[PDB]
Structure formats: C-alpha cells, structure tokens
Write a protein that binds this ligand. Structure first.
Ligand SMILES: *[C@@H]1O[C@H](CO)[C@@H](O)[C@H](O)[C@H]1NC(C)=O
Ligand SMILES: *[C@@H]1O[C@H](CO)[C@@H](O)[C@H](O)[C@H]1NC(C)=O
Ligand SMILES: [Cl-]
Ligand SMILES: [Cl-]
Ligand SMILES: [Cl-]
Ligand SMILES: [Cl-]
Ligand SMILES: [Cl-]
Ligand SMILES: [Cl-]
Ligand code: NA
Ligand code: NA
Lengths: 482, 482
C-alpha cells in the first residue's frame, strides 16, 4: 500500500461537523452516545413514504481523480420490530461552488445501493462498505445518503485518495504522483538521477498504480568516479580509497605502494620510488624496475658461448620482464672495447623473454664480458640499471658440423661451417681410421666427400679439420651397411 | 481486456441445466417464459420465515485462481404488493468431490449481500452485479443463493476467469498465463526469442495483470544476419537484398557493382572486375582501381623540376587515393636507366595525397621522364597500373639562393646551395654594380660576404655565381640605409 490522502473523516471530527438534512425536521439526525460516540441515525420504518437526505459538506477535490468512500454502519432487521427496508442509497454531486443550505437532490448521481452483511436485532455488528468514483473534474463534490425507511445508524464516513509517494530508488528521484482513475492505470514516471549519479551506457522509470504502489523499475543511475552508493545517494570515497569509473561497485581501497588518498579520489598517487605505466589501470599497485637476473652463467661449450640466466629476485611487482644482452672485448694486450659486429646471437639480443642465448663467431683467447640486463614496463621511468656480468674466453674457432648424408657397402659425408668463417678455410681435411696406426686422409675445398672402398658393417673414426694458412671437429663413428 | 474463460453460463444453457433447491418443494423454482426465456424465481414474501437455497452444479476449477461471478436479476418492491426483504445472499463452497444432492448450507461461505440498483413495481429493470472470490485451491466449487423473503427472478449467472493470452511481441513468444488472484499482481513472464532472433548486447519480459492485460514490455529480440522482421517473425532477406548484423533494421538492397543475392544473404558478392578491401563494410559497393591522374605537368623552373597533377577522371568509387612518383634518365648518347639516388623529392615520393612534388638535384641536359601513378585501396588486388608520364630537361645546375642578412650605410649578404652540390663549387663569385660599365667582383669559398664602402640609399645589382673547374643566381636589388 501507498499514500492515502484523507478528504473527509466524520468520526475524526467528534461531532463538531454538521451536515445538511432534507427535510430539516424529520429523517436523519445526529446522535451522541456517552465516552462520546457520534453518529447519524434515521429509523422511521413506520411512516409509509420516506425520502430522507443527508448531505455532507462540500469537499475540496484538489488533485484527486478517483476517490474512495468508506462507510461504517448498522442496519436493524425489518422483522425485528413487530413499509420497511434494510438498505440505503449513496449519491454524489460534483460542483465548483459550495451552495450551502441550498441542496437539490436532482443534481445527485447515484453511486450504489448499500446493503449490510450483518443485521442487528437490538451484539454491535458493524458493517463496512467501500465504493469509489472517478474521474472527478470540478473543484469539489458532495456525498449524500438516502433513506426510504431503513433503521440505520451511520458511524463513519472516510473519503481519501491514493498517491504514489515521493521515492528515492536506484540512485534516482521520483516525484509524488497521483494514482490514476482507471484500474489498468500504470503511469510511467521518469526519474531524476541524484547528484553525482549518471546513466552510463537504460533511463530510470517507475510505474504508478491505482492503489499508489510503484510497480516495475526500469533502468538505474550509477555513482560516478570518486563516488559510491551509500544508502540512497552518492558519497565521496573515504580517505584511503578510490573509484575510477561510474560503476555499481563500492570504492576500492588503495593498492600497494601508494599514497593515502583524500576524499573523492579517482586513483591513489604513487609512493616515492614507485611508478605506473601509461597502460596500467588505477587498480594496479605502484611498481618499480626489477632487480638483476638472479644468476647468470656464461659457458664456452666448444667455439660458441652459452649464456643461461634466471629471473630477478625482485620483479618490482611486474610480469612484463624483458632481457637485453650486450658485450665487451678485452685482449689479455690489456686494451678493451665494444663487441665486434661479427658476433651473432641465437635470438635478437634485446626484448628477450627467454632466459638464455647462444653467442657465436668469437675470436679465440679474447676475454668477452657479457652483461645481461633486466627491464620491466616501468624501466623507462628511472635512469638506474639492473644487470649481471659474466666473462668467457674461447680457444678453438668453429669446427665443421658433420653428418652422414647416406651410406652403403660407402660412407657419404657432409659438413658445414657458418658463412663468415668460410673465407678463412684453405682446405678441409678428412681423416678416417678403422676402430691403431693406419689412417686415410683426403682433402677438399667443398662440403661433402664420399669415403670409398670400405669394409661392410664397420665402425670408422671420422674427423674433419678446417685448415688455414686450424680447428677440427669431434670424432664421429659411422657404420657401413650389411 | 484479455482472455475470459467461462466456467458456467446459466442463460447459455436454455433450461437444460438443473440446479438443486433446498427445500425440494418450496422456494426457488425454474420458470420458463415464452421465444423461451428461462430463470430462477422465488417470491414467498408472505411466509414469515424463509431460508430458501439454490445451489449450482459442481464447477470444475481447472487453473483458475480468482473467479468472477456475474449475476443478472430483478427484485420487486416490498411496498409494491399490499416479513419482506429486497436483497439476497450469495455463497460459495470449495470441494474436491461433487456431492450431488447431498447439500449442506453450513459448508458455504458468504460472498456478499446482493442488492438491486433498480426495483420493479410489476418496465423490465435488469440489475447487474459482479463479485469475485479467490484464491481457490480445491478441484472445484459450488455457488448458492439464499433468499429470506425477497421476490427475485434470477436470469443469468456467469462465472469466468481471466488469462493473459499467448502473445507474439518484440520478436519473442509469451505463453498463455493465468491472471493472479491479488489485485496488485503483476506476474513477470519471460519471453522466448522466435527462430532466427536473438538478444544482442535486455531480455524480453511482459507483466500479466489481474484483468489479463499484458502491461510493461522490457527488452526485445532482434532478427540476426540474413534475416529481417516481417510482421511478428524473422524472414530471409529477399533475393537482391542483404543484412550483415543483428539489428532492428530491414534488409538493405544490394549496393553498386554487385551480383544479385540469393535469399538470406549477409552480403552481396562482387561483380566481375570489382572488389572490396578487407576494411570495407558489406554496405559499401564494389570498387576498382582508379584511372590515371587526369593531367600531369612537368616544368623545369630553374634547376628544379615541378610536377603538378590532377586526380583521376575515374576514382573507381573510392576516396583513399594515393600517388607515387618514379623516374627514368636518358642521355640524348641514347642510353637509358633508372633515376640516380642523388635525386631528391620535396616529400617522400610514395603514399602521396598531395597533387604535386618538387624534384631537385638534377644533371643538366639529361632527359628525365617522370611517371606518376594513382592507386586506391583495391589496387593491390589487380596487376594493372594507372599512370601518366611527363619529360623534362634541365639546363643550369642549382644556383646560390641569396638573401640579405642585414644592412647599413653596408650590405651584408648570405647564400646557400644544397650540400650535395657544395663539393662541386671551387669558389663563389659576387658581382655588384650600381643601378652601366663599372662592376665590382669579390670571391669567397664561404657562404657570406659584407659589401663595404657603399653609397647611402642606393640600389645595387647583386649576383652570386657558383664557380667550378658554372651556375649563377638571379640579379637581386639591395638598398642601403638612410
Ligand atoms: C675479463 O676477464 C678477466 C679474466 O681474464 C676477468 O677477471 C675480468 O674481470 C674480465 N673483465 C673486466 C672488464 O674486468
Ligand atoms: C625523353 O625525351 C624526349 C625528348 O627529348 C621525349 O620525346 C621522349 O619521349 C622521352 N622519353 C622516352 C623514354 O621516350
Ligand atoms: Cl449532540
Ligand atoms: Cl466510477
Ligand atoms: Cl692440398
Ligand atoms: Cl420449464
Ligand atoms: Cl476474495
Ligand atoms: Cl680566385
Ligand atoms: Na449495485
Ligand atoms: Na457487503
């Protein structure tokens, strides 16, 4: 149930309300019972022809469309005393002027015959009856009651109308609106967003019914950045909190490494020495550049150097860690300088996410120092650097990488060396022994030989040296067919 | 108003319906008036103590919650014949079994006292009265009528209940639902998207009221790609039409240069020789590469060449037109070849949106042919080329560009030439005459001289030649102070 606005309340007046009766003498009469109770009684069941009227004061209508008329009464049984009726009539008249004592029944429209559910034979049996009328349009109206020979006491008369009350809901405001006249009335009432609230992407609406109930909520408003919902309004975020968007969510407390916020903050400021990247959301804690790769190994396996490292002990709270590798040369001469352009990497030496690289094409005996640096998203915002160094010497230059391209029974062999080294080699020298003092060497400028005139199902020791005006491969075991 | 389902209709039965009366003899009785009209009459206003009951058949309730009971009747005036009442009583009883002739008034709950609005003194004055009761829960119910000494004819009795009908709205389906019992009942009923419809981003809902009206639509479904809304459903796009998205829009007809579509098309296919770029929306007509720049001029103003052109006559229906310039050299020797890397352009010679460029650093006497090509977004999809050619010869190499850096009374002069030409110059030669056979020449390797010992407020003719082991500027008029 919603708002009732009362227009008339006979009982609530304690007798001081005085209504016109026609005729002046006979018919309805005000009665007091004493604890005073007042009432309007008529009981002329004997007289053969009655037409007794009771007319209320002029009632100002205001904004009311449908009025509700609530009556409380007793009726005595026509068979309970030895031309009688047990009902009365209820009328109304609209009008813009209050006519005072000038009352004319012909201007009154009949609402209904009022009958009792219970009848007395004197147990105080109080009937209740409600009717309604609408739409009304004039400035005011009158009610009336007609008795044609009933024995009635009329104890109460309430006229009220219904409203949908002023409403705060869904962070919007809805004005008090008058319940409409027709029963299938749902009036759509637009809402107003309370201060610091907004409709983001459905606009707030409510539907006012004839009983004054608000029925079906459509849409809502949301508290904007720096504000949240507290009860029915928007409030500034507490000190220590933030909110960056218009959402239906509370203020989030300040993330890690951040400076205590003032009221209505859309984001907390960064702590000294901590930062944010231009892609980081306000919800992300302040971060910093990482420490150095925790461990780094530089191992000279063969002619190439392998660098293997480990992520930093401290990431500075980030997950976008990359590595970059740089190099210095030093001749143990004493002189030093940056790495030559002839050094290659197994992977472009910057923007590394892998934790290892292979370095090739290195001058022998030279002391190479490799520095591997760790950087995350906030690194460009500090001057400082986090790195580890490791030094390697290499002895042999790149040997030929040799494989079998086929076999019979004979052994068909191929090899390769990186194209920068290919200028250095004068000739390749192939050696083959049987698996103690009798080997066979051949020479070529090319990259493949077939070893001929060999024993079936036999293990041979094959080596390929790169010769210069050098560096030789590992011994391979190659077996002939059967 | 919505769906009424009738449960009982006395008048609509033409007498063949037969109701229990208590007592069997006295009281209510079926009467026929002849054009047959049937009715139930009691008129024992004389007898001192009446309690006459009329009980309907057992009525099966089905799914009904609130029933509506509509009566039509006459009542005669108790004063119209010389223990009388002018009302009757309406009761009901719920029950799961039909008890037949076994009728027990004590099981009947009173709905209301029924009174007439109009009373007869015989003009056929037919009162109408509606009441309702609910919620009901048992399998069926009975109505009854009680007369205590009224003279009533009862001509009609309709019990019905209300439903919200099965509904197609907003491209969703809503099941037939029973109107609820309570007046402030709005039952929310979810809808089902009809075939080929979808909820894109609010889900369809309707609200069923107690009178069987559907009240407030929330949400909708939309016809998906290849489909549109026709009446209350989704239909395949006509031949000749398309629709690419789920929207509330009709099928669009096929754009220009396109192949007639089959039913339910999401896009029309391209006409032979026409294309679409991988960024073009389905709504965009098929396009093609443009024609050549309509006009091109190649003019050798000085040492530089100016190319000015004009957009193509035919754009192939596009607005993303770019130009690119290329160059061939030919010595009038006869031999030809691509342009040297020493030729510069006033603007990177590809991706041009401008319709002109300046070409500088050109070898004298050489026949340069410039080709300017037009390309739009669909050009990469054809092999063909649209271009215009224009040829230019240049005579002089770049002269010094000379300006006054200051003056007195003297003239302080500076010049420049593009750094590629700066190697060629042995010395610069400055000549100055007074504005007929007496000039003064000086020489420098640098780019500025101050002319000294000059007359006040005087016009001088200054030229600067670039000398080689050449090319000289225009004559400038420089005036001293006063
Ligand atoms: C280079 O190698 C030596 C050992 O040969 C090592 O101790 C030294 O620290 C390395 N680099 C530099 C720049 O000190
Ligand atoms: C080059 O210039 C001549 C005139 O000197 C012109 O007629 C000729 O068509 C030009 N280019 C070519 C490649 O034919
Ligand atoms: Cl009094
Ligand atoms: Cl009304
Ligand atoms: Cl040799
Ligand atoms: Cl009959
Ligand atoms: Cl009820
Ligand atoms: Cl000289
Ligand atoms: Na009535
Ligand atoms: Na009643």
């Amino acid at each position: 149930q919603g708002k009732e606005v009362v227009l008339l309340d006979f009982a609530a007046a304690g007798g001081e309300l005085g209504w016109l009766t026609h005729p002046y003498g006979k018919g309805w009469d005000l009665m007091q019972n004493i604890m005073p109770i007042y009432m309007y009684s008529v009981c002329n069941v004997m007289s053969g022809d009655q037409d007794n009227w009771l007319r209320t004061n002029w009632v100002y209508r205001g904004e009311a469309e449908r009025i509700f008329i609530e009556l409380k009464f007793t009726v005595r049984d026509c068979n309970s005393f030895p031309s009688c009726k047990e009902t009365f009539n209820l009328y109304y008249a609209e009008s813009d002027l209050d006519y005072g004592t000038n009352f004319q029944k012909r201007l009154f429209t009949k609402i209904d015959t009022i009958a009792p559910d219970e009848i007395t034979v004197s147990h105080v049996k109080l009937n209740v009856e409600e009717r309604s009328v609408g739409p009304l349009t004039r400035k005011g109206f009158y009610l009336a009651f007609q008795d044609i020979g009933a024995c009635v006491a009329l104890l109460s008369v309430r006229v009220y109308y219904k409203k949908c009350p002023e409403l705060l809901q869904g962070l919007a405001h809805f004005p008090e609106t008058i319940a409409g006249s027709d029963a299938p009335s749902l009036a759509t009432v637009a809402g107003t967003c309370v201060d610091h609230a907004v409709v983001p992407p459905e606009e707030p609406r409510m539907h006012c019914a004839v009983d004054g109930e608000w029925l079906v909520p459509i849409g809502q408003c949301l508290c904007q950045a720096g504000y949240e919902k507290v009860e029915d309004a928007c409030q500034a975020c507490s000190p220590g909190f933030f909110k960056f968007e218009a959402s239906e969510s509370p203020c989030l407390e300040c993330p890690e490494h951040t400076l205590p916020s003032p009221e209505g903050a859309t984001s907390c400021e960064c702590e000294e020495g901590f930062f944010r990247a231009p892609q980081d959301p306000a919800s992300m804690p302040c971060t910093r550049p990482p420490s150095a790769p925790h461990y780094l190994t530089a191992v000279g396996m063969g002619a190439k150097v392998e660098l293997r490292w480990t992520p930093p002990q401290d990431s500075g709270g980030r997950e976008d860690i990359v590595y970059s590798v740089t190099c210095e040369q030093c001749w143990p001469s004493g002189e030093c300088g940056p790495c030559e352009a002839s050094v290659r990497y197994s992977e472009p030496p910057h923007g590394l996410t892998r934790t290892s690289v292979t370095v090739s094409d290195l001058e022998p005996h030279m002391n190479y120092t490799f520095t591997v640096e760790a950087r995350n998203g906030v690194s460009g915002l500090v001057t400082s650097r986090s790195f580890r160094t490791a030094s390697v010497s290499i002895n042999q230059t790149e040997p030929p990488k040799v494989r079998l391209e086929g076999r019979s029974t004979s052994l068909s062999v191929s090899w390769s060396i990186p194209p920068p080294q290919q200028s250095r080699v004068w000739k390749y020298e192939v050696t083959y022994r049987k698996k103690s003092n009798s080997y066979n060497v051949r020479r070529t400028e090319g990259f493949s030989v077939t070893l001929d005139d060999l024993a079936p199902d036999t293990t041979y020791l094959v080596q390929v040296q790169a010769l210069t005006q050098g560096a030789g491969s590992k011994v391979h075991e190659f077996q002939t067919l059967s």
